[PDB]
């Protein structure tokens, strides 16, 4: 029923990270309605396959290769949803479950067509941005500006330097997303803007602020 | 790569029968680029599953259930091709290979949408009628009129009775499709017309002729 089990585990990791939930084996098990033991065995095989690493505190860390694939699966999934909703007219309650199968069989060529054919490929019908469209191709720690890449990762805030800021509007944004020193947050450059996420709340940083906030790896 | 192997074997049986080729294990092996031994093992499992029977002369006979599924797979396959060609604009050289994956994951609901959304669902872009649209839901031997059903089957012509016919135009049609007594031909009611096929040449019978031609089971 899962069609491509490996790809489903990756897509589920992806969407847990999007939501700011720590990707743990029991959350994957719950989301895919699979047994914990079955998940643990499939996770072991994904490790052998180069797709994931189980960190010492048991969270799943997608390898850059795993992440690239997960991003591809998500992109296909969201473009299929837009197709099914925008063009096919499939009833909305069935769209995600259809795209959940289609995502494992859509080629890159179909996607490049969809990008031309659809009105807007900013987001799925369910509110989330479509990732990967670029790859389809149509002083403790480190300053956020230097540490962020085009692939998101979870890091820890070790300093904010509010004393050096002129752009003072984002202070409250950070506070309302409860981002403080010691918060573990996702970072990405996407761009020319860095974004911090905490608990699925996004803060798009101005560059003065991205120069000032310093992070450490988890 | 086959996505649903069982469904691929059925779709390949279907298309061999369409072409008037006897569905034999070596022709399936050849078409799917699978080993003979692998085909024979998968065929054994399909038998255990109720989908096919290997007749005493080694041809594959789809069970009515196998045939119903094969017809469903074909319908999904052809509607996907029309979608990919008519709406998506996928380059024609890639359409069949894409639909070859999509056919195993399209629900009935998507198909019912496609039937409304597409211009014409008479045929795939590759010239063959789309079957199953009805089930989607939007004196030796026996006279052809009595023996034919909505599901095609291979039978043997045992009598033609040309002496009793007034409609004399179809005689040559039969002759050019080399349908003579002793010819093994496919029959279907589809309708209100019976069709005889021999070697992938179709003859649509007038009812006077369908009353006259008598057939036996193989
Ligand atoms: Ni979805
Ligand atoms: Ni899926
Ligand atoms: Ni085809
Ligand atoms: Ni296929």
Curated annotation (Swiss-Prot), chains A, B:
Coiled-coil ranges from the UniProt annotation: none
Mainly resides where? Answer: cytoplasm
> Cystine bridges: which residues?
none
User: Where in the numbering of this chain does the HTH dtxR-type domain appear?
Assistant: 2-63
GO terms, molecular function: DNA binding; DNA-binding transcription factor activity; protein dimerization activity; transition metal ion binding
Source domain of life:
Bacteria
Do the record's keywords include Isomerase? Answer: no
| Record's subcellular location | Cytoplasm
Q: Could you tell me the Gene Ontology terms of the biological process aspect for this record?
A: negative regulation of DNA-templated transcription
One Gene Ontology CC term in the entry:
cytoplasm
In terms of PROSITE patterns, this protein maps to:
HTH_DTXR (PS50944)
What keywords does the record list, in alphabetical order? Answer: Cytoplasm, DNA-binding, Iron, Repressor, Transcription, Transcription regulation
By its UniProt entry, which InterPro entries does this protein fall under?
DtxR/IdeR_SH3, DtxR_MntR_Metal-Reg, Fe_dep_repressor, Fe_dep_repressor_sf, FeoA_core_dom, HTH_DTXR, Iron_dep_repressor, Transcriptional_repressor_C
Q: Could you describe the subunit structure of this protein?
A: Homodimer.
Similarity field: Belongs to the DtxR/MntR family.
What exactly does this protein do?
Iron-binding repressor of the dipheteria toxin gene expression. May serve as a global regulator of gene expression. Represses ripA under iron excess.
What is the protein's name according to its record?
Answer: Diphtheria toxin repressor
Species name for this entry? Corynebacterium diphtheriae (strain PW8)
User: Upper lineage ranks?
Assistant: Bacteria, Bacillati, Actinomycetota, Actinomycetes, Mycobacteriales
Which gene codes for it?
Answer: dtxR
